[PDB]
Amino acid sequence: LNRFTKTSQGRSWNTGNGSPDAICFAVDKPGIVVVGFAVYGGGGIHEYELEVLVDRWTSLELVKGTYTTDDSPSDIAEIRLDKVVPLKENVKYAVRLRNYGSRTANGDGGMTTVQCPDGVTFTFSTCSLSSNGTNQTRGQIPQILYYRS
């Protein structure tokens, strides 16, 4: 369900004051609709810009907001998109986070292919829009929130 098999010890992940973290994803099947993403927290309230793009990169949807995971035993908050994004099968998408605030948790032991119980395989890959460190193995954006239509 989550990209990552594990979580970092403590909150060592820098936000780089808006320096982009991104991951590039693609699906096996038609009908997948993205409604949101999970992001790591810790260190209180964060301001974020989160953008979905499609392969040069074209922007599809941008949300801006704030979140905290301080009120929870979870290190993860879920951001909902303002318009859902229906994906093309076997097409590379990117999600990009610009985050502002203190150090957060991050994920590790990232999986390049995640087979969902519903039959869909998600393929995760490193994405040139990311420069703050997120890649297939570690960093931000542990989950994509979706349903099949």
**Domains of the chain (ranges, CATH numbers):** 1-149 (2.60.120.820)
Q: Structure resolution in Å?
A: 2.2
Tell me, what DSSP letter sits at residue 88? Answer: P
Dihedral, 63, 67, 69, 71 alpha carbons, nearest 10? -140
* Residue 89 structure tokens: 């099968």
- Amino acid at the residue 30: P
Experimental technique of record: X-ray
* Residue 130 structure tokens: 């990311």
Helix, strand or coil for residue 23? strand
From residue 142, give the alpha-carbon distance in Å to each of 76, 78, 114: 8, 10, 12
Phi-psi region of 41 (alpha: psi -120 to 50; beta: other; left: phi over 0): beta
CB half-sphere exposure, 140, CA atoms < 13 A = 35
CA distance 33 to 86: 4
Q: Give per-residue burial for 59-70: e unless 16+ CB within 10 Å, then b.
A: ebbebeeebebe
Tell me, what DSSP letter sits at residue 96? Answer: E
